[model samples]
Target: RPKIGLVLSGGAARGLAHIGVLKALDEQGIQIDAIAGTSMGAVVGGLYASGYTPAELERIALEMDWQQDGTLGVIQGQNLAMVLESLLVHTSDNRDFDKLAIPFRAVSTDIATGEKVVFRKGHLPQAIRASMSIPAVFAPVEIDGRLLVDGGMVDNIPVDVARDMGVDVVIVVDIGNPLRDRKDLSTVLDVMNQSITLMTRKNSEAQLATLKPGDVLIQPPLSGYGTTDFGRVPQLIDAGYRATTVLAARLAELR
Candidate 1:
């Protein structure tokens, strides 16, 4: 059996595309031996490694109100964390990464020093939460004596992590920005948000450009920035499926 590693990117709602990619991979009878992801990728990838199917993931995404109550409030909202905890309860057997059906890795960043922290074994929920934390949008998570935030701030695609694990074929799904032009900011506050977004996107692009021959990059043709509209789930799913289909020949060659 070939050792296949799947790397998922961080793009908030854009991460939903991961479900469709999983769907296509399953249809192609591809078995993922190891998986790594950042931010929203951690959420989706965690569920998959825990044995949730693409259809099941889609159902969970559609049924859950991700922005309800404490998930998203101007003040005092722990709703996102609460929602994550609840989802993990249903989807994961335990917080232990070693117990997962497929070996999984979640990427996070230490706020104190700009270093990458890859969680391979430990409390699964905390790692997922820390990976998904997007500074300002989601509060930083304190773990292992360091404040943690989204892995995309450091290693977005994390293909290198997969390579280091000795996987023969590394399939990277990069939904990150590809050095796109920015729209004019209307205010100083907008500038701050845009700057962070650009920085993260640039970081992601830089890593993506480093892929060598034999390493596959499956970047779906996607636009728009920041949090995607929840209503576009179906569209995003189609985009993922289409992208995978476009890369079917290459993926088959790897297998």
Candidate 2:
């Protein structure tokens, strides 16, 4: 009878997978207290909450058609980076999901000069500023880079609050960072590693030792060449996430 919160994104086939998992949890007698999803996942979460069943969800996943040619289905990496830069640089408003997402499109040509200019422009206020204020979720005890976390924004609660509500995992999904095109995996790792370091400042040792290979480490193809980039199961084992299910399409584990 543990009350758990589920956070997911709606897009392509993954949203359907989320629904299936939700159904499984529901069958097991777990109460889903809150559900949050962003982008397409947000749309999927909405459908599930409206009472979609597992079979129905699977059908939705299978039936949906994605327009992937020429960046039609994918968000542009350059645009997303610009958006992030604007939010961090200016403090743009973050209340509207569209305002936040549109600028991140890889095709966006708009550029801001001077970090403070973005904040001065009032674009980073509200949702934009708020999003940046959230702390990183996954910190490396020995490495420096970007960190990941779960339940970024729910009913206006910070991620930390979500953890208190029985949502303890951080799933970082890079939809379209274009790291492959940019050929800057090292830089990406650095940023991600640094964030993880900050996230685990207090629980670094405790979480590190508890990590297993099979634990879910979610990622989108934008981070690399696949729909999902799993934690190197072997590397995770060495790092102390000793579990064996690291590369699954839909997976989870708790500390």
Candidate 3:
């Protein structure tokens, strides 16, 4: 009896593709026991844990308010926070991470130390807000004393969190962006994306290599997209779905 852990990685809007990945996994009849995620990964992964189906999320992602203010960072995070609470409170049933539909971990960065803040128990929405909070874009979430920002600063591909949950097998979905060439730099966000990519790439590469025989790693073909391309939601989801669909045989073995 092996419980499977599904770990979703961060890449801003790129993380929305996780919805498609989850849909494909469910179709493959893979039962995920524990789940962990960071940044946008935290958002989608939390929703799924709280009972939002992948089909529902793809629709929601498009209809939901994704507008970003031109100043400071982007959308108002507290506004996003309230909405997450509303969506999950009814479905989280327990309103706590440890008691979700599945035991879950939302990873954030402790801004003061650049280490990962693993939230196992606490307010579900607040914990996820911390995990998804990108510095400068959205304000850092201060719970008690720690200034927790996006988990991509440290563990964007949080495979370790799933392992800590004591699952026998881990299926990882890493939606991280590769470093773009100097000629590819355009907007301020792309520069920021590249910098963030630099911070996480090495750690992601190392953690990915640590996965052994039973662990599964999936990466969607997202090279043409940027972190803030909210307009590409449908395409991203399709990419995630199609990529994972090809791995049905490998994933089926986990069942």
Candidate 4:
């Protein structure tokens, strides 16, 4: 049996499509032995590694008001930790990564030094929250004197983490804007799109340039950023499902 590792990318709510990707993987009988994720990726990846089904996760994504507070004075603004607390009721008390249904790692970047912080072992909620903390949008998380932010700033697609975990194949899901062609922006919304495209394009290119053979890259269609649209959920999910179907044949050939 091949040790398959899953690497999820970050793009705010857009990353929720990863649930669909997971669902597709499940449907295709692709067993994920190890997982690594950044930002929103950590949220979905951690939950999946903790044993939440794709349907359950998709429901949570669609139903949960991510901006609403789940707890009083618990990191303020939306309380993502509390939201995670609700879904991961069983593993709430357990912080050991080995205890998870699948071994997992959540990647964050130390804002102080611009270094990658790989949370292979720690409090799952804390690790996840830190990884998803976007600069300016969410307050930085402090762990042992190191202030941390989104892992996408440094390692968006953590293939190295998977390789370190001894996986024979690494499937990387990159949701970042490829920024292949520039669009003329005359409106506010168009400018917003350009801003995001410019901010993430280089990073996406950097990651793509480093891809090795046997590494599968799934770059789904642009799924709008932040809280732009709720309707995009189904569209992204369907996109992920389709992308995996196309890759299923190639995945089978992995040792």
Over 39-149, each residue of candidate 4 has an lDDT whose tens digit, in order, gives 888889999999899999888877776554111122652477677666777775447785699999999888888888999876788888888887645778887788887
Tens digits of per-residue lDDT for model 1, 117-188: 999876677788889887666788888798888887788888888776668878899876433244545555
Q: Write down the TM-score for model 4.
A: 0.84
Q: Is candidate 3 or candidate 4 better by TM-score?
A: 3
Q: Give the candidates in order of lDDT, highest first.
A: 3, 1, 4, 2
In candidate 1 the C-alpha lDDT for residue 203 amounts to: 76
- Model 2 lDDT at residue 148: 17
Clashing residue pairs in candidate 4 are none
Candidate 4: residue 3 Cα off by (Å): 1.1
- TM-scores for all candidates: the values are 0.88, 0.34, 0.91, 0.84
- In candidate 2, what are the lDDT values of residues 1-255, reduced to their tens digit? 333444443222222334444444444444445444433344344345434554565554444333211110013323333443432443333333223321210000011210111111123222222222222321111101222112222211122222333444533221221212334335555456344334323232232234334323333322222322222322211221111123232443331
RMSD of 1: 3.9
lDDT of 2 at 112: 23
Candidate lDDT scores, in order, read 0.78, 0.31, 0.83, 0.76
